[PDB]
Design a protein around this motif. Sequence first.
Motif, PDB file in Angstrom:
ATOM      1  N   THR A 142       0.887  -1.179   0.000  1.00 17.86           N
ATOM      2  CA  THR A 142       0.000   0.000   0.000  1.00 17.86           C
ATOM      3  C   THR A 142       0.901   1.198   0.000  1.00 17.86           C
ATOM      4  O   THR A 142       1.037   1.874   1.033  1.00 17.86           O
ATOM      5  CB  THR A 142      -0.980   0.050   1.209  1.00 17.86           C
ATOM      6  N   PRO A 143       1.583   1.416  -1.121  1.00 15.90           N
ATOM      7  CA  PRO A 143       2.551   2.509  -1.190  1.00 15.90           C
ATOM      8  C   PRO A 143       1.994   3.956  -0.988  1.00 15.90           C
ATOM      9  O   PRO A 143       2.563   4.727  -0.277  1.00 15.90           O
ATOM     10  CB  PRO A 143       3.286   2.281  -2.514  1.00 15.90           C
ATOM     11  N   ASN A 144       0.824   4.348  -1.584  1.00 15.90           N
ATOM     12  CA  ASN A 144       0.323   5.712  -1.366  1.00 15.90           C
ATOM     13  C   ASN A 144       0.072   6.064   0.133  1.00 15.90           C
ATOM     14  O   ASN A 144       0.368   7.137   0.631  1.00 15.90           O
ATOM     15  CB  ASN A 144      -0.932   5.845  -2.253  1.00 15.90           C
ATOM     16  N   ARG A 145      -0.507   5.120   0.826  1.00 17.40           N
ATOM     17  CA  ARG A 145      -0.796   5.261   2.243  1.00 17.40           C
ATOM     18  C   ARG A 145       0.474   5.210   3.136  1.00 17.40           C
ATOM     19  O   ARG A 145       0.691   6.064   4.011  1.00 17.40           O
ATOM     20  CB  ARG A 145      -1.782   4.180   2.684  1.00 17.40           C
TER      21      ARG A 145
HETATM   22 CL   LIG Z   1      -2.137   2.672  -1.143  1.00 17.35          CL
END
Ligand SMILES: [Cl-]
Length: 162
Positions: A142-145
């Motif tokens: 979950t890279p964006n978060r």
């Molecule tokens: Cl994400």
Amino acid sequence: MNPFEMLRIDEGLRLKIYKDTEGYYTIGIGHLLTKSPSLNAAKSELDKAIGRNCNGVITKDEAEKLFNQDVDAAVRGILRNAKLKPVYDSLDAVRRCALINMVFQMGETGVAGFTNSLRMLQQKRWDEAAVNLAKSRWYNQTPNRAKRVITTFRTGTWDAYK
Ligand SMILES: [Cl-]
Ligand SMILES: [Cl-]
């Protein structure tokens, strides 16, 4: 900004059971129902959580409630955990929100696992801690978060959330 608004942004709000990023049954604001594949096992869990026959659907008020329980639990487990507590206590108000966020998403056990990042946060080595947090399944999945929370630990501001 506060821990609630923060999590509300990251988790969103859904009133019908749905499957989370790991394919697990969830509902409302990131309230995991079950790790079981069974839609029925979820609906059961739902009903016992809420105290009514929900038929897999709940109200805004009811999501807000479970949410309030979930934040409290995240906070209460940080406080109860020997590895987590000293970190939380050492941090400022903004950065505390970020550790709450990770705890809510991955649970106390999961976070306590990040031994090295935890030490760096406690030592206030921001840049270092952010590089290290990024070397994780969490970041890759979950890279964006993760980026949002990481920047929060990094700068100690709510910028990533505005
Ligand atoms: Cl994400
Ligand atoms: Cl990695």
